[PDB]
């Protein structure tokens, strides 16, 4: 156990300070450092001096050790394969190293459409969401929801009382929706080709149906949402916006689109929503649900699911993530014949529930 | 490029939610969950029901769905090799899996000496220390120190005005010092044998010199500290407690011991301290410095050094970490003949500076 006695200690030390890496990376997103490196052409290598000189420096005289701070941050970022670092065959310390973007880091720089996971980070580490984590110990021992134990009101009503958070929560969701939707539309899924009338549940501004009719103009589309949201709807030909409550009735259509709404509710309201869809659908039936499937047993290949599952229980404990068996049980409880997994797109699964 | 694209997207998604794992590990340590699993003998494999049935509940009865929350937390912890999970050979959901401790997790359970890295993790993620991370962008764009931009006073004076943080910091420092001291005193380093009188700089309560004279009774020990700290010292024969300022004078001795003092100060103050210590030593002597060496390049094998360097940067930015060349330059600036690296003990390097 000679190798264990030091490798395990090193891993424990690296785990003790685990919160430092997400704190620095967020800063490197807010400082627009990844953008400056990528604003000089492909295969770019910029020394810390150039990055510190092209920064949006409101103060003309940034302290002379700012290029040292940037170098110390970029060294940590490069140690985790987020950036590539190389030496200079040449002088100050800033002349020694050059940094460049990894394909991992290019997901945070805005893409051609202008969307990136960057704003999804700021939503996760914002103060309002972060203050919920300190009540987890109390929540486990005494029950309840971590968010309610801090702010009293349910998380579905808080954005109506906080201006600043209502912007971050709307930007992050839009960017994350667009990133997945662009690849979904470019994917090989052909389920939309046979759809005549499609109703989107919780479509917001209608971006999803916008893309749907963008590639398939023959599909007549209605965006179903709450009356509180429809007042922000952007008019667009073909699209029709319908306001109402999901749990009471759903507008009739030949197919139902829904993206990540089953994991925002409990195991009882989901049955009611599925039965409402069952009533709305005609004799022919089809539900196209984009979801995420928990593996039955822990494994190293599923980290990205679990890290987000624990995010949901400490923000709205009514909702939770489910495995394939639970989705099948809910579907057969609603009266549907069964479900089918079509394709994996951006770590999300497209599921067809057939009547 | 699909193989690269999917892997990069999955890794980016895993990186976006990177704070959830350190926020859940802290709650699982504070709840004393790792202790209950290891309080049933080696090769435990205890189900979530039993773990939820032995918690030191603050009320008569915990929430009925507490075992589900504990299971969901332990699944995430087992996905990262911190815990080992195994399916039961067949009932409730909590009956499905059994969890056991990995050698990585045994550093957080209080070992034979009653010390662990749990208090260090609690210190790192405390509110007072975590509020400094949100001013990093302002510090980079405008200079200064993140801690001073939040609390005004220097971090060396704050513990005198907050009783809770003063206790937390002391407990974490005691645990971390004790672990390293116990691991070092069992090692093969024999430099203490030739020392007649040894003076420890910043010895605190004297645990270091306590162990030194515990293994080597012939060594005469002097505990040098500030006058404000010496008052709490426990009387113990063989330890002469001397209060004073490190930057003014040092008591005479044949060897000077210091653990991580150098990285807490700027380059000028370090040179001043080394020059002051140069006067106390006789014509021949030793400086035994326990330090940590930054590699010249950001290799993937040294994360735990860069993480803690960034941690030290945004708390007392007047100090920083140094590489071997910088230590050598400081030593020859103080007038010492040279330095030697003796042994690597628990990711820390023992350095002997000879006159």
XYZ file of C-alpha atoms in Angstrom:
710
model
C 0.000 0.000 0.000
C 3.006 2.262 -0.536
C 1.456 3.871 -3.627
C -1.921 4.320 -1.918
C -0.433 6.139 1.090
C 0.542 9.099 -1.127
C -1.776 8.942 -4.157
C -4.839 8.802 -1.903
C -3.544 11.713 0.189
C -2.919 13.768 -2.950
C -6.431 13.013 -4.210
C -7.906 13.942 -0.819
C -6.011 17.248 -0.848
C -7.208 17.966 -4.391
C -10.767 17.198 -3.235
C -10.571 19.448 -0.159
C -10.054 22.589 -2.271
C -12.512 21.502 -4.973
C -14.549 24.721 -4.773
C -11.636 26.856 -6.003
C -11.756 25.706 -9.636
C -15.422 26.635 -10.353
C -14.864 30.006 -8.656
C -11.879 30.959 -10.824
C -13.404 29.647 -14.061
C -16.520 31.778 -13.571
C -14.264 34.821 -13.222
C -12.469 33.865 -16.438
C -15.915 33.856 -18.053
C -16.935 37.221 -16.598
C -13.580 38.854 -17.399
C -14.031 37.835 -21.062
C -10.613 36.153 -21.091
C -11.639 33.169 -23.220
C -13.069 35.624 -25.762
C -9.859 37.652 -26.121
C -7.797 34.517 -26.779
C -10.304 33.390 -29.434
C -10.505 36.897 -30.950
C -7.136 36.456 -32.676
C -7.693 33.624 -35.171
C -7.471 29.847 -34.854
C -4.393 28.233 -33.293
C -3.960 31.330 -31.145
C -1.361 31.724 -28.403
C -1.509 34.933 -26.361
C 0.795 35.830 -23.486
C -0.751 37.190 -20.264
C 0.530 40.688 -21.097
C -1.581 40.914 -24.258
C -4.675 39.596 -22.465
C -4.184 42.096 -19.641
C -3.688 44.876 -22.216
C -6.827 44.089 -24.253
C -9.058 43.753 -21.166
C -11.981 46.208 -20.910
C -9.960 48.174 -18.358
C -12.220 50.947 -17.074
C -9.324 52.098 -14.887
C -6.368 53.167 -17.014
C -3.814 52.148 -14.370
C -4.578 48.585 -13.439
C -2.102 47.580 -10.752
C 1.179 46.306 -12.256
C 0.630 42.849 -10.752
C -2.615 42.323 -12.686
C -0.705 40.444 -15.449
C 0.651 38.260 -12.640
C -2.867 37.580 -11.340
C -4.042 36.670 -14.841
C -1.032 34.383 -15.292
C -1.715 32.641 -11.973
C -5.366 32.106 -12.927
C -4.574 30.845 -16.427
C -1.999 28.412 -15.034
C -4.682 26.790 -12.869
C -7.090 26.713 -15.807
C -4.452 25.097 -18.045
C -3.608 22.479 -15.404
C -7.118 21.006 -15.861
C -6.952 20.633 -19.680
C -9.303 23.598 -20.142
C -6.438 25.526 -21.781
C -3.245 24.518 -23.560
C 0.011 26.055 -22.359
C 3.380 26.275 -24.100
C 6.770 27.787 -23.343
C 8.589 30.597 -25.159
C 12.107 30.112 -26.518
C 13.265 33.650 -25.717
C 12.513 39.135 -19.755
C 9.496 39.280 -17.456
C 7.599 36.228 -16.235
C 4.735 37.136 -18.583
C 7.025 36.439 -21.561
C 7.493 32.791 -20.566
C 4.114 31.139 -21.225
C 1.542 31.225 -24.027
C -2.044 29.994 -23.721
C -4.586 28.701 -26.216
C -8.143 27.422 -26.267
C -9.051 23.738 -25.951
C -12.186 22.403 -27.699
C -13.577 22.049 -24.175
C -13.266 25.806 -23.651
C -14.895 26.689 -26.984
C -18.318 25.816 -25.541
C -18.116 28.897 -23.289
C -17.100 31.319 -26.055
C -20.251 32.400 -27.951
C -20.823 30.325 -31.085
C -22.089 31.320 -34.537
C -25.657 31.715 -33.278
C -24.311 33.554 -30.231
C -25.114 30.968 -27.541
C -22.857 29.311 -24.983
C -22.969 27.514 -21.644
C -21.328 30.526 -19.987
C -24.564 32.061 -18.688
C -25.626 28.612 -17.458
C -22.708 28.799 -15.020
C -23.663 32.204 -13.597
C -27.176 30.938 -12.845
C -25.766 27.998 -10.876
C -23.311 30.067 -8.802
C -25.488 33.145 -8.245
C -26.026 34.207 -4.639
C -29.745 33.374 -4.594
C -29.144 29.789 -5.719
C -25.944 29.396 -3.698
C -27.517 30.357 -0.365
C -29.746 27.269 -0.628
C -26.821 24.862 -0.230
C -26.046 25.827 3.375
C -29.460 24.575 4.546
C -29.016 21.042 3.168
C -27.946 19.705 6.571
C -31.090 21.115 8.161
C -33.282 19.876 5.318
C -32.019 16.293 5.583
C -32.566 16.100 9.350
C -35.868 18.010 9.551
C -37.463 17.672 6.105
C -38.803 20.316 3.782
C -37.111 22.014 0.845
C -33.753 23.849 1.086
C -35.006 26.825 -0.937
C -38.201 27.272 1.086
C -36.253 27.048 4.352
C -34.310 30.136 3.227
C -36.697 32.322 1.215
C -40.083 31.137 2.499
C -41.854 31.348 -0.850
C -41.709 28.602 -3.456
C -39.070 28.930 -6.177
C -41.810 29.292 -8.811
C -42.870 32.633 -7.292
C -39.487 34.135 -6.363
C -38.616 35.455 -9.880
C -41.703 37.666 -9.674
C -40.236 39.455 -6.647
C -36.580 39.838 -7.707
C -35.601 41.895 -10.781
C -31.947 40.845 -11.061
C -32.529 37.092 -10.732
C -35.385 37.211 -13.262
C -32.824 38.202 -15.926
C -30.204 35.532 -15.182
C -32.854 32.809 -14.916
C -34.232 33.859 -18.318
C -30.880 34.215 -20.096
C -29.426 30.900 -18.914
C -32.531 28.903 -19.833
C -32.712 30.477 -23.299
C -29.038 29.774 -24.032
C -29.225 26.183 -22.785
C -32.415 25.573 -24.776
C -30.935 26.989 -27.985
C -27.680 25.021 -27.691
C -29.529 21.695 -27.528
C -32.257 22.683 -29.994
C -29.838 23.621 -32.776
C -28.254 20.158 -32.687
C -31.652 18.478 -32.311
C -32.873 20.183 -35.484
C -29.656 19.188 -37.280
C -29.986 15.595 -36.027
C -31.395 12.580 -37.874
C -34.668 12.401 -35.896
C -37.473 12.212 -38.470
C -40.454 12.120 -36.093
C -41.620 15.608 -37.067
C -42.095 14.668 -40.740
C -45.441 12.899 -40.164
C -46.846 15.515 -37.767
C -49.753 17.635 -39.006
C -50.639 19.710 -35.921
C -48.117 20.110 -33.101
C -48.775 21.660 -29.677
C -45.816 22.734 -27.535
C -46.348 22.648 -23.768
C -44.498 25.392 -21.921
C -42.906 26.810 -25.065
C -42.312 30.287 -23.672
C -41.636 32.746 -26.487
C -42.040 30.049 -29.155
C -38.406 29.487 -30.175
C -38.889 25.714 -30.322
C -41.933 25.915 -32.584
C -40.129 28.673 -34.488
C -37.383 26.219 -35.458
C -39.924 23.428 -36.024
C -41.782 25.450 -38.655
C -38.455 26.834 -39.892
C -37.445 23.399 -41.143
C -41.025 22.092 -41.588
C -43.262 24.944 -42.810
C -46.282 22.666 -43.324
C -46.688 22.127 -39.568
C -49.332 24.334 -37.959
C -48.065 25.289 -34.506
C -49.671 26.509 -31.284
C -47.591 27.496 -28.257
C -49.391 26.606 -25.016
C -48.386 28.599 -21.949
C -49.703 30.329 -18.857
C -51.573 33.654 -19.273
C -48.860 35.344 -17.211
C -46.296 34.520 -19.908
C -48.306 35.062 -23.119
C -48.216 38.851 -22.737
C -44.555 38.719 -23.820
C -45.262 36.620 -26.926
C -43.665 37.810 -30.150
C -46.108 37.674 -33.097
C -44.953 35.364 -35.882
C -46.918 34.027 -38.876
C -48.250 30.495 -38.578
C -47.615 30.437 -34.840
C -50.621 30.786 -32.569
C -50.249 31.444 -28.844
C -52.754 29.870 -26.437
C -52.883 30.804 -22.763
C -54.117 28.460 -20.070
C -53.220 26.060 -17.287
C -51.498 22.792 -18.179
C -53.265 20.835 -15.427
C -56.787 21.763 -16.582
C -56.804 21.225 -20.358
C -54.450 21.114 -23.339
C -55.293 22.386 -26.851
C -56.038 19.639 -29.350
C -53.344 18.574 -31.785
C -51.829 15.635 -33.612
C -48.662 15.675 -31.481
C -47.338 17.141 -28.232
C -43.853 18.578 -27.763
C -42.457 18.934 -24.248
C -38.882 19.549 -23.101
C -37.774 18.931 -19.531
C -41.122 19.538 -17.837
C -41.667 16.068 -16.359
C -38.702 16.438 -13.991
C -40.001 19.755 -12.601
C -42.994 18.087 -10.903
C -43.747 15.236 -8.513
C -44.880 11.692 -9.330
C -48.577 12.636 -9.012
C -48.973 15.818 -11.071
C -47.112 14.126 -13.930
C -49.851 11.489 -14.117
C -52.487 14.237 -14.268
C -50.605 16.040 -17.052
C -50.190 12.799 -19.002
C -53.906 12.044 -18.639
C -54.733 15.554 -19.861
C -52.554 14.915 -22.914
C -54.284 11.544 -23.357
C -57.657 13.303 -23.413
C -56.418 16.003 -25.805
C -54.903 13.626 -28.362
C -57.051 12.037 -31.101
C -57.277 8.303 -31.811
C -53.786 8.535 -33.297
C -51.305 9.514 -30.621
C -47.696 10.620 -30.224
C -45.783 12.350 -27.420
C -42.270 13.597 -28.204
C -40.609 14.189 -24.837
C -36.981 15.283 -24.529
C -35.675 14.042 -21.189
C -32.665 12.681 -19.326
C -32.319 9.099 -18.117
C -30.669 8.165 -14.829
C -28.550 5.000 -15.051
C -29.680 2.288 -12.665
C -26.294 1.941 -10.934
C -23.561 4.540 -10.331
C -20.789 4.609 -12.921
C -18.051 6.952 -14.085
C -19.868 7.556 -17.390
C -22.888 9.317 -15.866
C -21.400 12.102 -13.725
C -23.053 14.878 -15.736
C -26.466 13.516 -14.797
C -25.941 13.126 -11.051
C -24.282 16.536 -10.643
C -27.455 18.084 -12.037
C -29.872 15.798 -10.178
C -28.612 17.095 -6.834
C -29.105 20.572 -8.294
C -32.846 20.006 -8.668
C -33.607 18.649 -5.193
C -32.058 21.704 -3.496
C -33.882 24.195 -5.738
C -37.356 22.645 -6.157
C -37.633 19.372 -4.244
C -41.037 18.615 -5.761
C -39.244 17.588 -8.937
C -36.712 14.816 -9.442
C -34.994 12.825 -12.162
C -36.260 9.407 -13.207
C -34.984 6.271 -14.902
C -36.449 4.463 -17.902
C -38.567 2.143 -15.752
C -40.263 5.051 -13.972
C -41.092 6.751 -17.283
C -42.544 3.479 -18.578
C -44.615 3.061 -15.410
C -45.963 6.616 -15.665
C -46.810 6.121 -19.343
C -48.698 2.871 -18.760
C -50.441 4.477 -15.781
C -51.641 7.241 -18.110
C -52.993 4.581 -20.482
C -50.406 4.855 -23.258
C -49.360 1.653 -25.010
C -45.646 2.219 -24.424
C -42.516 4.283 -24.928
C -39.524 4.104 -27.259
C -36.081 5.708 -27.032
C -35.190 7.145 -30.435
C -31.801 8.875 -30.289
C -29.357 10.477 -27.873
C -28.826 14.171 -28.660
C -26.526 16.373 -26.554
C -26.621 13.899 -23.647
C -30.433 14.039 -23.744
C -32.797 11.267 -24.843
C -35.733 11.726 -27.216
C -38.647 9.514 -26.135
C -41.761 8.692 -28.157
C -44.814 7.741 -26.107
C -47.355 6.104 -28.408
C -51.087 5.885 -27.726
C -15.368 14.353 -35.173
C -18.516 13.026 -33.505
C -16.428 11.144 -30.928
C -14.668 14.379 -29.973
C -17.863 16.453 -30.136
C -19.955 14.284 -27.813
C -17.120 13.830 -25.306
C -16.375 17.565 -25.259
C -20.044 18.448 -24.767
C -20.382 15.929 -21.933
C -17.244 17.299 -20.269
C -18.489 20.885 -20.635
C -21.815 19.917 -19.050
C -19.945 18.202 -16.208
C -17.833 21.354 -15.745
C -20.821 23.726 -15.693
C -22.240 22.164 -12.505
C -18.830 21.713 -10.852
C -19.814 23.269 -7.498
C -22.493 20.672 -6.694
C -19.987 17.980 -5.699
C -18.052 20.182 -3.210
C -21.355 21.484 -1.831
C -22.663 17.934 -1.300
C -19.410 16.596 0.181
C -19.527 19.279 2.880
C -23.119 18.373 3.795
C -22.257 14.662 3.858
C -19.296 15.379 6.165
C -21.262 17.668 8.492
C -24.102 15.125 8.724
C -21.590 12.525 9.985
C -22.525 10.060 7.235
C -18.984 8.857 6.512
C -18.612 8.148 10.245
C -21.726 5.961 10.511
C -20.634 3.792 7.569
C -17.236 3.207 9.221
C -18.712 2.701 12.703
C -19.741 -0.840 11.768
C -16.347 -2.383 11.064
C -14.369 -2.706 7.838
C -16.141 -3.843 4.660
C -19.383 -2.365 5.937
C -21.722 -1.905 2.952
C -24.597 -0.277 4.870
C -27.886 0.543 3.159
C -29.316 4.091 3.180
C -32.092 3.023 5.575
C -29.648 2.163 8.365
C -27.673 5.366 7.770
C -30.898 7.378 7.987
C -31.846 5.417 11.124
C -28.756 6.422 13.149
C -28.433 10.139 12.390
C -28.249 12.407 15.486
C -31.660 13.860 14.711
C -32.508 17.255 16.187
C -36.173 16.212 16.467
C -38.165 13.155 17.494
C -38.630 11.855 13.937
C -37.001 12.767 10.633
C -38.959 13.300 7.440
C -40.309 10.074 5.880
C -38.485 10.877 2.626
C -35.092 11.499 4.256
C -33.752 8.065 3.132
C -34.498 9.086 -0.460
C -32.447 12.278 -0.105
C -29.610 10.355 1.543
C -29.687 7.774 -1.254
C -29.617 10.495 -3.920
C -26.629 12.149 -2.226
C -24.716 8.897 -1.748
C -25.275 7.972 -5.400
C -23.541 11.183 -6.490
C -20.733 10.599 -3.997
C -20.253 7.020 -5.236
C -20.175 8.162 -8.872
C -16.845 9.922 -8.158
C -15.034 6.942 -6.550
C -15.399 8.529 -3.107
C -17.703 5.635 -2.137
C -18.144 2.099 -3.427
C -21.685 1.097 -4.362
C -23.014 -2.417 -4.880
C -26.459 -3.717 -5.762
C -28.160 -6.042 -3.291
C -29.024 -9.585 -4.410
C -32.816 -9.743 -4.276
C -38.886 -3.668 -1.508
C -38.267 0.065 -1.213
C -35.927 2.096 -3.406
C -33.481 2.601 -0.525
C -33.066 -1.189 -0.239
C -31.535 -1.500 -3.720
C -27.967 -0.341 -3.024
C -25.257 -0.700 -0.380
C -22.456 1.821 0.163
C -18.974 1.485 1.629
C -15.940 3.655 2.250
C -13.074 4.063 -0.224
C -9.522 4.717 1.036
C -9.984 8.224 -0.391
C -12.877 8.860 2.003
C -11.013 7.578 5.072
C -9.040 10.838 5.280
C -12.247 12.631 6.314
C -13.207 10.133 9.032
C -11.264 10.921 12.249
C -8.371 8.452 12.261
C -6.434 6.982 15.199
C -5.072 10.398 16.211
C -8.540 11.955 15.957
C -7.584 14.245 13.060
C -8.914 14.567 9.523
C -9.323 16.982 6.624
C -12.978 17.704 7.430
C -12.281 20.930 9.331
C -10.125 22.146 6.435
C -13.028 21.626 4.028
C -15.353 23.444 6.429
C -12.900 26.357 6.683
C -12.512 26.618 2.902
C -16.271 26.872 2.248
C -17.282 29.116 5.155
C -19.386 32.176 4.350
C -16.712 34.661 5.447
C -14.107 33.117 3.133
C -16.551 32.405 0.293
C -17.762 36.009 0.083
C -14.260 36.950 -1.118
C -14.567 34.991 -4.371
C -17.262 37.284 -5.797
C -14.899 40.289 -5.868
C -12.230 38.557 -7.977
C -13.323 40.351 -11.155
C -13.124 43.721 -9.420
C -9.736 42.845 -7.949
C -8.353 41.890 -11.366
C -9.782 44.947 -13.132
C -8.847 47.477 -10.418
C -6.093 45.967 -8.264
C -6.032 45.392 -4.539
C -6.934 42.285 -2.562
C -10.347 40.547 -2.750
C -10.634 40.171 1.032
C -9.894 43.837 1.749
C -12.386 44.928 -0.918
C -15.099 43.123 1.073
C -14.206 43.488 4.761
C -11.900 46.530 4.718
C -9.496 45.276 7.378
C -6.589 42.968 6.604
C -7.245 39.240 6.981
C -4.623 39.054 9.750
C -6.856 41.196 11.998
C -10.343 39.864 11.170
C -10.163 36.751 13.434
C -9.865 39.088 16.420
C -13.334 40.509 15.713
C -15.359 37.351 14.902
C -15.500 34.588 17.537
C -16.897 31.877 15.241
C -14.356 32.263 12.437
C -11.561 32.499 15.011
C -12.520 29.052 16.318
C -13.063 27.519 12.865
C -9.697 28.703 11.539
C -7.853 27.484 14.636
C -9.503 24.053 14.486
C -8.772 23.606 10.775
C -5.155 24.707 11.174
C -4.641 22.387 14.156
C -6.028 19.386 12.257
C -3.991 20.072 9.118
C -0.782 20.660 11.083
C -1.266 17.521 13.188
C -1.796 15.251 10.170
C 1.396 16.415 8.455
C 3.401 16.391 11.687
C 2.416 12.808 12.489
C 3.188 11.664 8.946
C 6.553 13.461 8.925
C 7.750 12.278 12.332
C 7.301 8.670 11.175
C 9.397 9.283 8.039
C 13.106 8.719 7.404
C 14.234 12.354 7.756
C 17.032 12.487 10.341
C 17.980 16.179 10.283
C 16.736 16.776 13.827
C 19.329 14.408 15.315
C 22.294 16.807 15.186
C 20.387 19.800 16.602
C 21.318 20.831 20.141
C 18.953 23.806 20.498
C 16.064 24.183 18.047
C 13.922 27.318 17.708
C 10.535 27.088 15.982
C 9.227 30.283 14.380
C 5.481 30.698 14.778
C 5.013 27.503 16.783
C 1.603 28.439 18.160
C 0.711 26.212 21.104
C 3.900 24.169 20.674
C 2.552 20.934 19.163
C 5.435 20.856 16.679
C 8.183 21.184 19.285
C 6.095 18.895 21.499
C 6.470 16.057 18.994
C 10.100 16.958 18.224
C 11.151 16.590 21.860
C 8.784 13.624 22.206
C 10.876 11.635 19.737
C 14.175 13.392 20.617
C 14.283 14.210 24.356
C 17.804 15.681 24.135
C 16.660 18.625 21.989
C 16.109 21.967 23.717
C 13.026 23.693 22.320
C 12.134 27.390 22.149
C 8.652 28.373 20.949
C 8.852 31.828 19.351
C 5.553 33.621 18.808
C 3.824 36.977 18.987
C 3.026 38.360 22.472
C -0.717 38.214 21.756
C -0.587 34.474 21.017
C 1.878 33.273 23.672
C -0.599 33.894 26.505
C -2.591 30.773 25.551
C 0.467 28.486 25.632
C 0.205 25.353 27.758
C 3.082 24.985 30.265
C 5.292 22.045 29.307
C 8.871 21.513 30.523
C 11.500 21.753 27.808
C 9.553 24.342 25.786
C 10.764 27.877 26.511
C 7.995 30.198 25.321
C 9.333 33.504 23.958
C 7.034 36.285 22.790
C 8.203 38.838 20.263
C 8.115 40.060 16.684
C 9.569 37.816 13.982
C 10.742 40.834 11.970
C 12.733 42.353 14.865
C 14.844 39.587 16.428
C 14.934 35.802 16.740
C 16.228 33.828 19.756
C 19.598 32.187 19.224
C 19.753 28.503 18.358
C 21.580 25.915 16.302
C 18.601 25.306 13.987
C 15.509 27.265 12.956
C 12.294 25.413 12.100
C 9.475 26.948 10.071
C 6.358 25.443 8.481
C 4.846 27.436 5.631
C 5.794 30.817 7.070
C 7.449 32.009 3.849
C 4.402 31.739 1.581
C 2.429 34.005 3.946
C 4.572 37.074 3.161
C 5.795 39.105 0.205
C 9.292 38.799 -1.244
C 10.679 41.808 0.649
C 9.383 40.652 4.036
C 10.659 37.122 3.382
C 14.130 38.490 2.628
C 13.985 40.628 5.778
C 12.953 37.617 7.876
C 15.725 35.456 6.421
C 18.299 38.190 7.068
C 17.073 38.569 10.658
C 17.292 34.804 11.175
C 20.808 34.865 9.689
C 22.000 36.817 12.742
C 20.615 34.391 15.345
C 22.377 31.313 13.967
C 26.009 30.595 14.912
C 28.821 30.216 12.370
C 27.118 27.011 11.182
C 23.439 26.165 11.324
C 20.347 24.937 9.537
C 17.030 26.356 8.383
C 14.431 23.577 8.170
C 11.597 24.975 6.061
C 8.534 22.892 5.230
C 7.306 24.327 1.942
C 5.561 23.479 -1.316
C 7.179 23.789 -4.735
C 5.318 25.067 -7.783
C 6.323 23.184 -10.948
C 7.668 25.431 -13.684
C 4.993 24.244 -16.137
C 1.253 23.579 -15.635
C 1.464 19.802 -15.793
C -1.649 17.770 -15.022
C 0.099 15.931 -12.161
C 0.129 18.905 -9.774
C -3.440 20.218 -9.467
C -3.458 20.383 -5.665
C -0.685 22.976 -5.713
C -2.385 25.343 -8.164
C -5.761 25.072 -6.411
C -4.266 26.050 -3.057
C -2.135 28.757 -4.687
C -5.310 30.329 -6.067
C -6.913 29.913 -2.644
C -4.019 31.774 -1.006
C -4.111 34.464 -3.699
C -7.664 35.659 -2.963
C -7.341 35.727 0.839
C -4.019 37.418 1.791
C -2.711 38.436 -1.652
C 0.350 40.026 -0.031
C 1.630 36.450 -0.020
C 2.067 33.879 -2.766
C 3.606 30.523 -3.614
C 7.089 30.183 -5.079
C 9.140 27.761 -7.155
C 12.541 26.253 -6.398
C 14.433 28.992 -8.244
C 12.724 31.736 -6.230
C 13.567 29.980 -2.954
C 17.196 29.647 -4.058
C 17.314 33.325 -5.036
C 15.913 34.367 -1.652
C 18.394 32.112 0.150
C 21.427 33.525 -1.658
C 20.019 37.028 -1.168
C 19.997 36.372 2.584
C 23.632 35.237 2.386
C 23.143 31.488 2.802
C 25.447 29.168 0.869
C 22.632 27.069 -0.590
C 19.598 24.852 -0.144
C 18.825 21.144 -0.427
C 15.538 19.326 -0.997
C 15.479 16.342 1.351
C 12.219 14.385 1.131
C 8.645 14.690 -0.119
C 6.260 14.139 2.807
C 2.507 14.349 2.140
C 2.962 16.517 -0.977
C 5.163 18.941 1.014
C 8.913 19.358 0.504
C 11.407 19.617 3.355
C 14.127 22.143 2.490
C 17.391 22.594 4.379
C 19.040 25.993 3.950
C 22.661 25.862 5.106
C 24.821 28.833 6.089
